[PDB]
Design a protein around this ligand. Structure first.
Ligand SMILES: *[C@@H]1O[C@H](CO)[C@@H](O[C@@H]2O[C@H](CO)[C@@H](O[C@@H]3O[C@H](CO)[C@@H](O)[C@H](O)[C@@H]3O)[C@H](O)[C@H]2NC(C)=O)[C@H](O)[C@H]1NC(C)=O
Ligand SMILES: *[C@@H]1O[C@H](CO)[C@@H](O[C@@H]2O[C@H](CO)[C@@H](O)[C@H](O)[C@H]2NC(C)=O)[C@H](O)[C@H]1NC(C)=O
Ligand SMILES: *[C@@H]1O[C@H](CO)[C@@H](O[C@@H]2O[C@H](CO)[C@@H](O)[C@H](O)[C@H]2NC(C)=O)[C@H](O)[C@H]1NC(C)=O
Ligand SMILES: *[C@@H]1O[C@H](CO)[C@@H](O)[C@H](O)[C@H]1NC(C)=O
Ligand SMILES: *[C@@H]1O[C@H](CO)[C@@H](O)[C@H](O)[C@H]1NC(C)=O
Ligand SMILES: *[C@@H]1O[C@H](CO)[C@@H](O)[C@H](O)[C@H]1NC(C)=O
Ligand SMILES: *[C@@H]1O[C@H](CO)[C@@H](O)[C@H](O)[C@H]1NC(C)=O
Ligand SMILES: *[C@@H]1O[C@H](CO)[C@@H](O)[C@H](O)[C@H]1NC(C)=O
Lengths: 169, 243, 49
């Protein structure tokens, strides 16, 4: 029933032998155990990034953490299981996820019956992330277009955290 | 090669041990300074976890539901693995977890299993557990489970196709009881098999021409409030359905 | 910003003060996807070739 072929260097392609390897892909009721290689992108830390670590995602700034963990653990969690830390899958460092900065935009308006001089306060953000030439950092947010004075005065146009604006010559 | 180890005494299992405490870590999470409420397959605090003793061996087949608790007080090192499966015979596919120096060998196949498994005892042999195998689904090597007088605790859970094993080995001064205080088990392996397990039994070894006690239980869906520190370690716990 | 204030308030005359006209959102500049160390320790390579 089983016989050899007279395969020779002088036969044409239809008869010439070939070494054939066959790839066949199966799905059964089991956890998957095989896939191809994966490719990571380069890690950037102190910038807003749309991150994906082992399938877990979010947007933020990722920098070195002062947290400790068991060799076992991979992710840190905040309220309602929001990820607040990851360990890198390749680099054995714990990285703290700072949510990417957000806040409202508060516009400091003179009476329009006086002038068109307007400054803008960006809430919950540093003047590293927003700027312009007249850029000052307040406790409330990043203030651009206004100047700062060391003296105290009464309060006409509130910024927050003890800081309040007004108009002077 | 397979031999009959059976004591042939009824040896009613004892329930003189309460299982005061013991959980496993539910996920890979860096939690700290938090009491986190988790609903998972935890063993109840203060439960009817059975006390068994071998050597004249005591290694009966006990049911496996969603998961199983196992512990031992060995110094004598007579335990070398566990067998799990739907029938533990040649009718269905089954899983053998066997420990030896430096590692554990894990195999899942349709095996022809003997009536009372044991290990050959220098040289070692698993032909006292199974006579043959074919139609294999899974093979795995990593790190030993029975790592080495500590209480050796393990939890075996079988969900979503994975056989999840957690463990801890904590020093003891006890012979027939458990140490008191809170402790949580860490994952040893997350094993991707696709196996249906309904019952299991212990693999013992002794030169055939010391002895050991075992504590075996089962786990239930329960809610626990778990206390985590600034290390990711669970340091304490409350069983929300006990009292 | 002066015009933004007039629009948020539905007025072409505005009294001295602070009004919220828009929201501030820092945008992501990059995309980072990370996977564990990948090594081809696989019997697949004993068949192909
Ligand atoms: C994943 O693979 C990377 C390679 O891209 C591994 O990083 C490599 O780790 C080794 C061991 O630490 C490094 O060798 C030594 O590193 C130290 C400090 O980096 C250096 O002082 C020694 O001279 C020596 O080179 C190697 O440099 C490092 N490579 C890079 C690019 O960082 C990484 O360990 C692997 N991760 C896992 C989880 O296996
Ligand atoms: C203990 O078991 C390990 C693996 O769990 C044994 O490793 C064997 O290694 C040889 C050669 O490297 C392989 O051919 C075998 O397939 C492995 N055996 C098994 C059962 O996987 C190791 O030899 C065993 N003994 C010791 C003393 O470590
Ligand atoms: C959690 O980790 C902290 C930080 O390393 C440990 O605190 C250290 O404890 C050692 C000895 O126990 C001291 O030498 C260090 O001075 C401590 N470091 C700090 C920053 O306090 C602590 O032991 C760990 N806790 C647990 C329960 O593992
Ligand atoms: C941002 O401003 C805050 C003021 O609360 C300051 O503490 C912090 O150092 C600033 N960060 C940067 C990066 O300038
Ligand atoms: C305000 O104080 C800062 C910091 O001491 C100083 O550099 C600056 O000259 C002061 N400005 C005025 C107007 O006094
Ligand atoms: C289970 O433990 C309880 C402790 O409340 C005990 O009363 C009982 O005897 C044990 N069960 C059996 C079947 O022995
Ligand atoms: C062989 O194992 C595979 C994977 O579990 C299964 O699909 C198949 O039904 C098994 N065959 C027999 C005869 O057990
Ligand atoms: C396990 O048994 C159940 C019976 O409900 C069956 O539906 C399922 O296919 C089995 N799973 C595996 C992985 O064999």
């Amino acid at each position: 029933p089983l016989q050899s072929y007279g395969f020779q260097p002088t036969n044409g392609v239809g008869y010439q032998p070939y070494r054939v390897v066959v790839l066949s892909f199966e799905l059964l009721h089991a956890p998957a155990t095989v896939c191809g290689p994966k490719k990571s992108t380069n890690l950037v830390k102190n910038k807003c990034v749309n991150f994906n670590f082992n399938g877990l995602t979010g947007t933020g700034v990722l920098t070195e953490s002062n947290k400790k963990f068991l060799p076992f653990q991979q992710f840190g969690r905040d309220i309602a299981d929001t990820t607040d830390a990851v360990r890198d899958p390749q680099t054995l460092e714990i990285l703290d996820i700072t949510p990417c900065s957000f806040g409202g935009v508060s516009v400091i308006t003179p009476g329009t019956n006086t002038s068109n001089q307007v400054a803008v306060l960006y809430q919950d953000v540093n003047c590293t992330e927003v700027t312009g030439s007249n850029v000052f950092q307040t406790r409330a947010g990043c203030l651009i277009g206004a100047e700062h004075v060391n003296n105290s005065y009464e309060c006409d146009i509130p910024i927050g955290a003890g800081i309040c604006a007004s108009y002077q010559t | 090669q397979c031999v009959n180890l059976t004591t042939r005494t009824q040896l009613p299992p004892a329930y003189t041990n309460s299982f005061t405490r013991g959980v496993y870590y539910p996920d890979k999470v860096f939690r700290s300074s938090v009491l986190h409420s988790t609903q998972d397959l935890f063993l109840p605090f203060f439960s009817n976890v059975t006390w068994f003793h071998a050597i004249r061996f005591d290694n009966p087949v006990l049911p496996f539901n969603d998961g199983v608790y196992f512990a031992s007080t060995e110094k004598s090192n007579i335990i070398r693995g566990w067998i799990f499966g739907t029938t533990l015979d040649s009718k269905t596919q089954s899983l053998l977890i066997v420990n030896n120096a430096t590692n554990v060998v894990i195999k899942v196949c349709e095996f022809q299993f003997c009536n009372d498994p044991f290990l050959g005892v220098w040289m070692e042999s698993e032909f006292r557990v199974y006579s043959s195998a074919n139609n294999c689904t899974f093979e795995y090597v990593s790190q030993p489970f029975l790592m080495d007088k500590n209480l050796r605790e393990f939890v075996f859970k079988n969900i979503d196709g994975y056989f999840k094993i957690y463990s801890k080995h904590t020093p003891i001064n006890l012979v027939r009881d458990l140490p008191q205080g809170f402790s949580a088990l860490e994952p040893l392996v997350d094993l991707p098999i696709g196996i249906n397990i309904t019952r299991f039994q212990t693999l013992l070894a002794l030169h055939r021409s010391g002895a050991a006690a075992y504590y075996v239980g089962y786990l239930q869906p329960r809610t626990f409030l778990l206390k985590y520190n600034e290390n990711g370690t669970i340091t304490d716990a409350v069983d929300c359905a006990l009292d | 910003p002066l015009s933004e204030t007039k629009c948020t308030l539905k007025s072409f005359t505005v009294e001295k003060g602070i009004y919220q006209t828009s929201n501030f959102r820092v945008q992501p500049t990059e995309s980072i996807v990370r996977f564990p160390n990948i090594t081809n320790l696989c019997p697949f390579g004993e068949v192909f070739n």
